[PDB]
Amino acid sequence: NFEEPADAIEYRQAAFGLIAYNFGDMGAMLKGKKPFDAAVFSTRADNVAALSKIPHEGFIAGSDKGDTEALAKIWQDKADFDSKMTAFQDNAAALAVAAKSSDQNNIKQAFANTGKSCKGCHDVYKKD
Amino acid sequence: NFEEPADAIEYRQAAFGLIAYNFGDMGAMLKGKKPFDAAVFSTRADNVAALSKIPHEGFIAGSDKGDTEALAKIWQDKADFDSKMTAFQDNAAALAVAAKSSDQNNIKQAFANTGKSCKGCHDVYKKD
Ligand code: HEC
Numbered sequence: 001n002f003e004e005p006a007d008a009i010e011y012r013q014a015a016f017g018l019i020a021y022n023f024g025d026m027g028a029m030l031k032g033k034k035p036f037d038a039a040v041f042s043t044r045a046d047n048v049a050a051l052s053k054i055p056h057e058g059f060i061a062g063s064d065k066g067d068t069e070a071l072a073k074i075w076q077d078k079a080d081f082d083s084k085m086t087a088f089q090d091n092a093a094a095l096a097v098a099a100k101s102s103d104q105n106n107i108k109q110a111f112a113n114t115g116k117s118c119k120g121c122h123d124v125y126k127k128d
Numbered sequence: 129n130f131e132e133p134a135d136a137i138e139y140r141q142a143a144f145g146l147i148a149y150n151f152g153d154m155g156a157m158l159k160g161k162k163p164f165d166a167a168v169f170s171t172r173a174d175n176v177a178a179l180s181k182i183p184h185e186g187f188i189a190g191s192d193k194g195d196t197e198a199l200a201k202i203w204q205d206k207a208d209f210d211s212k213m214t215a216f217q218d219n220a221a222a223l224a225v226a227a228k229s230s231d232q233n234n235i236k237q238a239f240a241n242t243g244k245s246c247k248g249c250h251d252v253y254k255k256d
């Protein structure tokens with residue numbers, strides 16, 4: 001569905017920028033930068049879970065050139081990339097469900113598990 | 129939560145781009161331009177319905193200034209803008225429901241109802 005590689009890059013960059021903004025607001029609440037607000041937290045969690053479904057489609061073959069932070073390694077080891085992306089989606093979904101209840105510890109763990117997805121993929125597949 | 133106004137603009141622009149990609153793919157399948165897949169159509173509908181809840185947050189006061197196609201009129205009649213935005217969210221949710229059926233006439237009309245949301249806001253609140 002992408003006419004040019006720049007379109008696939010823009011698609012996936014846009015999605016991750018939206019992810020990072022919404023995920024960072026949950027982090028701010030859990031880290032104590034701002035008070036925990038259950039209603040906003042749940043919107044943020046719902047948003048990350050839905051947005052997690054988006055960027056994978058942009059990682060098309062032949063889109064490592066130009067203005068992207070994606071490494072060529074993605075396409076050398078695509079099944080591992082895909083495994084990490086799936087695990088991220090599943091972790092984000094689990095965070096959304098945790099955010100529908102009051103148990104704070106369950107939220108904290110789900111957030112942490114999701115965060116470990118970001119870092120695990122970042123470390124292998126994104127430019128420093 | 130935006131560090132600078134330009135970030136609010138970039139945020140809403142990114143969300144609309146992802147809406148347009150997903151909405152456009154659905155339209156292409158209804159209009160004979162690529163093969164119809166009901167599962168993909170459905171998940172795109174679900175993407176649109178979730179994404180429709182994202183861009184509103186970016187329409188902060190003052191952010192008619194900058195690299196934006198948002199008209200200052202947004203903030204002259206933010207009630208009407210917000211009514212249009214929530215109606216969009218409602219029409220997108222309805223399209224996602226319709227897409228869980230095989231009633232093609234209802235799906236075509238749900239798609240048209242959602243497209244009317246796009247046009248109605250575009251015509252009033254976005255630069256030509
Ligand atoms: C691989 C399975 C990833 C997971 C899980 C997450 N991210 Fe990531 N992210 C990844 C890549 C390969 C890229 C580069 C995309 C490109 O073409 O440049 C990124 C990018 C980001 C960005 C930058 C977006 C931009 O404005 O260009 C951010 C802010 C970002 N990623 C954040 C992020 C967070 C918070 C994640 C977990 C909630 C996360 N990513 C997961 C690969 C992967």
Ligand code: HEC
Pocket residue numbers: 137140141142144145147148151195196197198199209212213216242243245246247249250253254
């Ligand atoms: C008002 C309630 C809107 C509705 C409903 C929809 N859109 Fe829109 N869109 C709106 C504005 C004011 C803007 C300008 C944003 C800015 O700061 O420039 C936009 C922009 C877009 C874009 C361009 C995004 C970009 O890359 O800059 C697209 C592709 C877009 N809008 C598409 C779109 C579609 C398909 C919609 C219905 C499914 C839709 N928009 C609804 C205002 C509103």
